[PDB]
Symmetry: D2
Subunit: 114 residues, 4 copies
């Protein structure tokens, strides 16, 4: 139901071994840890959640971009990249969060399919 | 020392009347409100802070993209766009945070000058 | 060796049935048709070429964005999106050209892997 | 009536000294040279044309990204970034073409005002 894909705009490659933390907003407006992992050699992170657990609500996907750039020896601007969105039940729908990283910039999009 | 510029990729226009909230991480690791404003007819937000008040720190620039799209009658994907960065850690700099918005995507970059 | 992936930033979806034309630069500096097709329901276009035919050289990938937006009833800015690059033999390497489309903007990146 | 702004996503700076060539499609369907210039210290290129000369037409704004990256000692992916659009077909407009550059990626948008 939820996949993350991360690309590197400097090297033209998947962004490999990037830590990704997913949080769900709780009733008291705090961010509860939900799922996490590291991107694969294809820049993808699968297996974060299941349809049973991924209920409607507000989610935050935090991509640890600073550590990624530092491990490449490159000085980055952002602490991390944060993608915050609402999951809404609207028929069967898979969410892909994609991010394209540069040292001082990033782009993110959602691919939501049935 | 801190300016925000927001563009609309659907209309090919400045993103006008976008609310922007800036936070600064406090010594107890909470986000403290630091400044806020709205983008002008040119999509720019000036006057958020002064060189005196804009000390070293970790800052979060929250661009209220959902309220922007909904005020135009559009249901967007993201709750907001969040830009988090350490500022002024090598002395005062001037920061422009630019964002380019679509209903399911956004790109952000920083222009940092001395 | 060469794949094209096209995403829609307005709808948060693959860009389906987008015409894509690939050209190779000829010795007289003209653009010779090389391969073409339409993106699938996943926004992907596979099978454009083979390793035997995809020799080093300058290539142009033209994505017919204007017709895509017009078929959705949306007025776009660009005539098409053009991605021009050199293919260089540098060990075994697959090229993915990705593009993320909005009516007045697009982003493109290359994912080049072994 | 036509301005070009170019930013560097690796350095977080204006892209300075970027060559830009503008073409206009002629009645015989060839690209005729129309104007050219280079971006300034602020990453902006002004003065390309006048309201009198900038008639209706299909225009191509070629941003010489490869020479930019190579002059900085970097081997980039794309030959250039090409922005192709019909202009002034509903009367004179002011066009800003903005581009945000990385070695393997770029994003471009247009700001069109009346
Ligand atoms: C973010 C982003 N993503 N993609 C692009 C092409 C952009 C930035 C565009 C921009 C930034 C500034 Br500052 C400007 O003054 C103007 Br005009 C345009
Ligand atoms: C271009 C561009 N600009 N901005 C972003 C976030 C993109 C690329 C998104 C992308 C690329 C590939 Br290949 C995928 O498989 C998937 Br899913 C998504
Ligand atoms: C996505 O672009 C992607 C990779 F980065 C690597 C692969 F082996 C396959 C892919 F689709
Ligand atoms: C900045 O790019 C900008 C706009 F987007 C719109 C305007 F009317 C004036 C500007 F400077
Ligand atoms: C890429 O994002 C993508 C689609 F658009 C659709 C799919 F079924 C699978 C994918 F990886
Ligand atoms: C435009 O954003 C801009 C730069 F990128 C750099 C400068 F020094 C001045 C500018 F207006």
């Amino acid at each position: 139901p939820l996949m993350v894909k991360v690309l590197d705009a400097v090297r033209g490659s998947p962004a490999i071994n990037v830590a990704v933390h997913v949080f769900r907003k709780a009733a008291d407006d705090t961010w509860e840890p939900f799922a996490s992992g590291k991107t694969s050699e294809s820049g993808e992170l699968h297996g974060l959640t299941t349809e049973e657990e991924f209920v409607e609500g507000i989610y935050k996907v935090e991509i640890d971009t600073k550590s990624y750039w530092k491990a490449l020896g490159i000085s980055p601007f952002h602490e991390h990249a944060e993608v915050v969105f609402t999951a809404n039940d609207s028929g069967p729908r898979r969410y892909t969060i994609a991010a394209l990283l540069s040292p001082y910039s990033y782009s993110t999009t959602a691919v939501v399919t049935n």
